[PDB]
Design a protein around this nucleic acid. Structure first.
Ligand SMILES: *OP(=O)(O)OC[C@H]1O[C@@H](n2cnc3c(N)ncnc32)[C@H](O)[C@@H]1O
Length: 637
DNA sequence: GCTGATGCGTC
DNA sequence: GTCGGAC
DNA sequence: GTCCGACGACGCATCAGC
């Protein structure tokens, strides 16, 4: 049948058996996957991407079920289940070395072209005494990626380069483009987890697994009205999405899906302590008015938004405790102190639970929350080891599971009541998030002010009874986050000088994707780098920046511009442009020189979450925010 | 082994 | 983390 | 609203060049 180079999963009236490019029972060719990625990359309509991926997956299900799992992971650019912690350990540097070797070019030449094009894939693809090696297969490429991720220790980079070179030598057509993009962590299809799930549920709905070959049912949706088909696929999609959000692990879900089908899947893969789940997320909301409009017909609660790290705390029946990050990373080992206090935070009647909390640094002498930067510096504190002044404190804000019962479909009013009834607070150790139930604008505004005075970032807002569940599948950003620095005109902005630009990648290829900013150190008469900047401009504004900063490019840096440890710009810029920049906090920096010596001996100051607001056309660089002003902003935190 | 660089997680 | 583009 | 991928500071385990 068909050579894979001609595979077209975007064709009208795609037939999963007749339009595939491999025979039943054989390994899915990687070129089939690459061709699907091509047809996805070529469009901007996400629903067209889903249809195209679904066509590939239908053929995988019909012909080669064992390759469904690797094909899905390749489509997500995942190495496996997130809690297993697999990491390629391949940066652009190592990848470029492998490309240079495979293409027979000097490294600097490949590096410069990759920076200019904004994409390593284009260099690997568009850049033989031996006949080709066997064609790449989807499962074979996936296992090679996992081989790369497993390599560790001295000389491991050399072994990784050998695997990558081996892949590139076997590539044809567009394969090297997507293998290089995968290895760089930037597959950039425009299609990610939500679209992959929609494609998968559509595929197994239209082309059910488990059919003796050839499958008699290849397009089950076909004969329905447009409305009935849409409703049916939505319902099937929700079955998969709700299961995935409770058990975000394709290693678990896919074998069940293939053996038992989608309808039975929830009976086999269930929320359970010890298995990380997807956390509820929050939509940014730029003011109280937007909150009220969003929750127009629903009573809601406001809670302090604590400035720490999420900690999903699992207590299994029998006493084992596990702690997971918001991205399902196993964090159990960072918190032995916490784990030994679990019998202290729960009533004796609690036999199992899943808590949603923020881990925060707490200074027990000052009795106050410390900045996130302090928290990330805390070393693990063994129980029976000597006590230190600052410790991790949990601020609990949700209860997902209790005594063998999932609370995912319960309204927050009930989950919060069970949380408050069944758990016990200890200052500096385990505390319920401070909250207020109101619709009064002035009360909300005063509560927002108080959260900031109490060392928090702002407010989380959550409905209590209407659309108030923990069902990520229904709405992943079911909560709202309201920060003072979202309010334009509110909070501290800086006027900073653009001293450098960085070539853009991906969506920014062909212009500047980032910029190096500086404050003005009056005492030493120098500009000091303070942060980089890569968000806040519209596409049109970024085009304007590219055009006006192009003219200011210098071959060699000005001698009064100090950047110390900052990334050297691709283009140094005549210090001229002054931009208004907003941030959330100021941090003590290990690399930036701004205001060094004014607050800390060895460290300058940088900006947390900086973003572009507007050009200060009226201001000259001498009128930029000074480094003394930067120190003033830091101290008043 | 020493030293500086960095991939990748957190936010 | 923030942000804006495509739908 | 939803989904996606541009881009930020920073800590550190672990890497390569000697
Ligand atoms: O900015 P963001 O989308 O990452 O915000 C969500 C995160 O905020 C943290 N957090 C802190 N305090 C709360 C409360 N009270 N409720 C919910 N989330 C909260 C979480 O870590 C969350 O990921």
């Amino acid at each position: 049948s068909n050579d894979p180079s001609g595979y077209n999963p975007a064709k009208n009236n795609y037939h999963p058996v007749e339009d595939a490019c491999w025979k039943p029972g054989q390994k899915v060719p990687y070129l089939a996957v690459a061709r699907t990625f091509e047809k996805i990359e070529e469009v901007s309509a996400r629903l067209r991407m889903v249809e195209t991926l679904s066509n590939l997956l239908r053929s995988v299900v019909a012909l080669s079920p064992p390759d469904l799992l690797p094909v899905l992971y390749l489509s997500l650019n995942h190495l496996g289940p997130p809690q297993q912690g697999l990491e390629l350990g391949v940066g652009d540097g190592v990848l470029l070395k492998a490309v240079a070797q495979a293409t027979g070019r000097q490294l600097e030449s490949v590096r410069a072209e990759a920076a200019e094009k904004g994409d390593v894939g284009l260099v690997a693809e568009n850049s033989r005494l031996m006949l080709p090696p066997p064609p790449l297969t989807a499962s074979g490429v996936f296992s090679k990626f996992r081989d790369i991720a497993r390599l560790t220790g001295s000389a491991s980079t050399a072994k990784k380069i050998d695997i990558i070179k081996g892949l590139f030598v076997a590539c044809r057509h567009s394969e090297a483009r997507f293998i290089a993009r995968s290895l760089s962590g930037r597959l950039r299809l425009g299609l990610a987890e939500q679209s992959v799930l929609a494609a998968l549920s559509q595929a197994v709905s239209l082309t059910p697994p488990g059919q003796e070959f050839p499958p008699a049912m290849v397009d089950a949706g076909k004969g329905k009205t447009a409305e009935a088909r849409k409703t049916w696929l939505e319902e099937q999609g929700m079955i998969l999405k709700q299961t995935f959000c409770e058990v975000p692990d394709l290693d678990r879900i896919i074998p069940v899906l293939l053996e038992h089908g989608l309808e039975r899947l929830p009976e086999h893969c269930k929320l359970s302590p010890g298995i990380p789940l997807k956390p509820m997320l929050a939509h940014p909301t730029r003011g109280i008015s937007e909150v009220l409009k969003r929750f127009e017909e629903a009573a809601f609660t406001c809670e302090y938004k604590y400035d720490g790290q999420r900690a999903q705390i699992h207590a299994l029946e029998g006493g084992e405790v596990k702690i997971f990050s918001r991205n399902q990373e196993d964090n159990t080992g960072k918190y032995p102190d916490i784990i030994s206090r679990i019998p202290k935070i729960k009533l004796p009647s609690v036999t199992s639970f899943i808590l949603d909390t923020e881990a925060v640094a707490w200074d027990r002498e000052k009795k106050q929350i410390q900045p996130f930067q302090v928290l990330t510096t805390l070393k693990r504190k063994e129980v029976d080891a000597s006590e230190i002044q600052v410790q991790v404190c949990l601020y609990a804000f949700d209860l997902i599971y209790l005594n063998g019962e999932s609370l995912v479909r319960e309204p927050l009013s009930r989950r919060r009541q069970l949380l408050r009834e069944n758990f016990v607070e200890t200052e500096g150790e385990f505390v319920f998030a401070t909250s207020l139930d109101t619709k009064d604008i002035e009360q909300i505004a005063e509560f927002l002010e108080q959260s900031v005075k109490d060392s928090c970032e702002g407010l989380m807002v959550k409905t209590l009874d209407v659309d108030a569940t923990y069902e990520i599948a229904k709405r992943s950003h079911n909560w709202l986050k309201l920060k003072k620095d979202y309010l334009d005109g509110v909070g501290d902005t800086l006027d900073l000088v653009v001293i450098g630009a960085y070539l853009g990648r991906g969506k920014r290829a062909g212009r500047y994707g980032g910029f190096l900013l500086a404050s003005y150190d009056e005492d030493s008469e120098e500009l000091q780098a303070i942060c980089k900047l890569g968000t806040g401009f519209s596409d049109e504004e970024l085009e304007e920046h590219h055009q006006s900063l192009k003219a200011l490019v210098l071959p060699s840096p000005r001698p009064y511009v100090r950047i110390d440890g900052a990334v050297i710009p691709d283009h140094w810029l005549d210090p001229s442009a002054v931009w208004e920049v907003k941030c959330a906090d100021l941090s003590l920096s290990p690399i930036y020189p701004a205001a060094r010596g004014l607050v800390d001996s060895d460290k300058g100051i940088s900006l947390r979450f900086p973003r572009f607001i507007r050009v200060r056309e009226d201001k000259q660089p001498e009128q930029a925010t000074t480094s003394a002003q930067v120190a003033c902003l830091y101290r008043k935190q």
